[PDB]
Amino acid sequence: VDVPKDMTKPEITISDEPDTLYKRLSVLVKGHDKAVLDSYEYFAVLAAKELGISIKVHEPPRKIERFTLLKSVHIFKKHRVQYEMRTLYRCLELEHLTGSTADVYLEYIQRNLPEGVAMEVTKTKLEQLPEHIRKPIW
Amino acid sequence: LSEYAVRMSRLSARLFGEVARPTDSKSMKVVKLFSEQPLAKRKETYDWYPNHNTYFALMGTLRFLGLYRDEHQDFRDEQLRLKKLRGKGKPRKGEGKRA
Amino acid sequence: SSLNLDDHAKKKLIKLVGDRYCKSTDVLTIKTDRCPLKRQNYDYAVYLLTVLYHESWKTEEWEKKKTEADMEE
């Protein structure tokens, strides 16, 4: 029943600089276990739907790295022990995302990133022609 | 290959910043020497070895301060004590075979 | 297709930029890596775009020495 009344105090100063428009934002998460990435996709999709982003999710093909090492510590080169590192992929595309909405979505996504995965963002910012090109100069 | 193509090849090289005048195959290595980072300055090379001096010294001081207890160093000291008791220790300087 | 290139200027730009232009999709891709920072590369990348356009309109004197084997059509 007893709660801290009005414990919210953030400020959002709306300046005069025009916002940056991103044509399309691509997020590619890579990890070792599918289950973590499967849950992470659900978290990203659920948050994206609530913000109204209309995202699409696809799974790029995986790649497997293998290498071979000797077994014993002396001679015996006919017996090998192999190892394998598996990197599973998952891509989340974002379309028609403004700069202001991009900042909050990415930082909210990045802070909740699990320890066993990492991600790369490819932002396709769009803008008009340069002043020299736009303004007629021969 | 015509004179028109030579100008276009040079004009494109001027804008993008490559070498304009013709250059020998062996003479292009000097560009490669400065374009890339030298092998001796890469972080993988000069920082290859962890500083064992700090790692060993730090745990040495913490062992004497009672904050870190090392089993392995205790094993050496305990066995070293037994050798002294048995009468077989390390002689001082100038005591090996000169006597 | 969204620029103000002339018939002569567009042909020179394709012959100047080289393989960075795709003949099917009519898209020009400029990739810059020399500048240490992304802001310097962005300023350098836009610098290449504007200097490649102001140069495609300079019909220099030697340009008339065209060979019949160098014509694209």
């Binding site: 340069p130 002043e131 020299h132 | 100008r7 040079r10 004009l11 001027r14 304009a20 005048r21 | 836009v46 610098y47 504007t50 200097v51 102001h54 220099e60 030697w62």
Partner: peptide
């Protein structure tokens, strides 16, 4: 034998000093 190092080439870096500074 041949010799022609002074190729008839013309290009001025200072011509594009303007776009170099600002858009």
């Amino acid at each position: 034998k041949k010799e022609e190092p002074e190729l008839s080439d013309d290009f001025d870096v200072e011509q594009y000093k303007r776009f170099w500074t600002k858009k």
